[PDB]
Design a protein around this ligand. Structure first.
Ligand SMILES: [Cl-]
Length: 64
């Protein structure tokens, strides 16, 4: 599976520690535009980082 775009976002946000969480929950690159707070919660990502991720998806034009 492709996790490279998700990695790029996390590095940009200083949240690379959650690469594992994405891989574990199968939050592959095609899921990036679809990410929800519930999905990230199921991936064991704490509240703060959830906000930064969901805000990045809403703003980055390179997120399909
Ligand atoms: Cl929580």
């Amino acid at each position: 599976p492709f996790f490279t775009r998700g990695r790029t976002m996390l590095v940009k946000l200083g949240l690379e520690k959650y690469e594992k969480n994405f891989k574990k929950g199968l939050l592959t690159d095609p899921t990036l535009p679809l990410l929800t707070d519930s999905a990230l919660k199921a991936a064991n990502i704490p509240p703060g980082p959830r906000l930064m991720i969901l805000d990045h998806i809403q703003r980055d034009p390179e997120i399909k």
